[PDB]
Every structure is written in C-alpha cells, then in structure tokens.
Amino acid sequence: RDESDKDGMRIVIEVKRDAVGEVVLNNLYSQTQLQVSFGINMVALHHGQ
DNA sequence: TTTTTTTTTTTTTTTTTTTTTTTTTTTTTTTTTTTTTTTTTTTTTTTTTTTTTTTTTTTTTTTTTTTTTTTTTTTTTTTTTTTTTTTTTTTTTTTTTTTTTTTTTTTTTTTTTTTTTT
DNA sequence: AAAAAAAAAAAAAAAAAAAAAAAAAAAAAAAAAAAAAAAAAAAAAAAAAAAAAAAAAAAAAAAAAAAAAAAAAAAAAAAAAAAAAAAAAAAAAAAAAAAAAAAAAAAAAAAAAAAAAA
C-alpha cells in the first residue's frame, strides 16, 4: 500500500508471518529500485570547451 | 482526291493474389471450499508431598551356542570413457534520465446538405 | 416522398505519440566449465565353511527402589465462536486455421487516330 498523507511518504509492505522481514528488506534493496547507483560524471563548459 | 498501314485504350471478363471476417485450444481469473490462529471457561487433566508392599539385581556356580577361526571364489568395487544436466561468463536488447525534431485525436452548439431505409 | 444519420463550417473543453544523444542498470538468451549419472573392463573384501571354544541367561533368595493409594492444589488442553490463507472448479479468451470478396495482370480484337503512297 501507499499511505502518503502529505506528511512524508509511507509505503507499507506487510511481511508474511513465516518470514523475517529483514531478509525481505534486503531482497528488496538488492532487486527493486530502493537502492540505485548514481554515476557521477562532472563535465562542464570551461572557457567554452 | 481517294485509299492503305500501324498504334493504342477500350468493349473489357477471367485467373491470381491479397485483404478482411471468422471461431478451437491452453492460459487467466472469480468463486466456494478446506487448512491455519486467537480468546473463554470448563470440567477436566495434571504437578507435587507422604506411606506402603513389592519384584528385579546383585553374593556364587554351571554350560553351550554364539564367538573363535582359515581359506575359495565369488562380485561388488573401482577405473576409464562418454553423455546429460547444472551452473556461471558473455553478449544482446530494452528502459530511464533531460533538451531537441516532428506530429495525432474525442466531444458541444446550429443549420444545411447528402445518403440510406420505410 | 417521409425518417434517420454523417459531414462540414468556427470558437471552446480535454488529451496522446515517434525518434536522437550517453551511461547505468536489469532481463534474457547463449557457450562452456564442471560435476552426477551410466556402460563396460579388471579386480579384491566378504560370506562361506569348519573346528574349536568359553561368557552370560538360569536358578536360589534377600532387600531396596518402587507404582498404587490418598490428599491438596495448579492450571494445560478441548470445544465453541470468529477471522484469515491458500487451493480446485468452472468459465472466458486471443491468436489462428478456414472461408469469401476485391485489386492487378492478361492478352483477343476493334474504334479512333496518325501518318504516308500514288
């Protein structure tokens, strides 16, 4: 569910009874877009080049 | 002035191909039906002192049939080879980010004309 | 000849989509190491076999830990209410083979035309 009540976002992911929750969260970080890689590439025009 | 040769698009309608309407089979999806978990209380089950008469282990000795035993020849075990499956590098493809180039649609409102049905 | 529906005029309401360019991630499909599994060789520990043996069940009998009886008291589990999880039953569906209608090529032959001969 999503419960974003304009008081900060709130995505509720209820975990099943036969699960640890931390393992589910680690799997979500590994697989889903809860963790992303930001590739820095600092290119800018210096003296018009 | 009359008469002669040639050229193509039409009378074309039929053969071939394409396009457009169709409906059998394996993959989704909503329903009922059966596995799970938490409370009340409830007679009911079950934990823990005391006494008691019991029935199996430890003095001692006996034997016999399972523990000794050696040896032949099997046959499971191991070796090499090859096939089948599993699993991971490799490659390919696709999506999102932010400024650019391009486009495309659905309805109100009135009045008049085409364009089908009865 | 009556009814009905499309379409077009111009100011209004409101939407949708395709690509380029680089760099990173995520699916998804392949070669290729790598180890189970299986067929077919020789090979070698185990059962057989036999004689020979001595270690633990019987038997006598005391006695000492015991399982039933009695009592008090604690409170686990069972059945009845509700409330969720998860799987077969049945029905539906999108591509997909089958059929039918329209576009392009085909030549047989002639109307009209253009051109030229004597």
Curated annotation (Swiss-Prot):
Superkingdom: Bacteria
Subcellular compartments: Cytoplasm
Other facts: When the enzyme transiently cleaves DNA a phosphotyrosine bond is formed between GyrA and DNA. In the presence of quinolones this intermediate can be trapped and is used as an indicator of drug toxicity. The enzyme-DNA intermediate is also the target of a number of topoisomerase poisons, including toxin CcdB.
Domain writeup: An N-terminal fragment (residues 1-523) can be reconstituted with GyrB, but the complex no longer has negative supercoiling or ATP-independent DNA relaxation activities, although it is capable of DNA cleavage; ATP-dependent relaxation is inhibited by novobiocin and non-hydrolyzable ATP analogs. The fragment has ATP-dependent DNA relaxation and 30-fold improved decatenation activities, unlike holoenzyme it preferentially binds supercoiled DNA.
Function: A type II topoisomerase that negatively supercoils closed circular double-stranded (ds) DNA in an ATP-dependent manner to maintain chromosomes in an underwound state. This makes better substrates for topoisomerase IV (ParC and ParE) which is the main enzyme that unlinks newly replicated chromosomes in E.coli. Gyrase catalyzes the interconversion of other topological isomers of dsDNA rings, including catenanes. Relaxes negatively supercoiled DNA in an ATP-independent manner. Negative supercoiling favors strand separation, and DNA replication, transcription, recombination and repair, all of which involve strand separation. Type II topoisomerases break and join 2 DNA strands simultaneously in an ATP-dependent manner.
Family per record: Belongs to the type II topoisomerase GyrA/ParC subunit family.
Subunit relationships: Heterotetramer, composed of two GyrA and two GyrB chains. In the heterotetramer, GyrA contains the active site tyrosine that forms a transient covalent intermediate with the DNA, while GyrB binds cofactors and catalyzes ATP hydrolysis. Can form a 2:2 complex with toxin CcdB in which GyrA is inactive; rejuvenation of GyrA(2)CcdB(2) is effected by CcdA.
Name this polypeptide is given: DNA gyrase subunit A
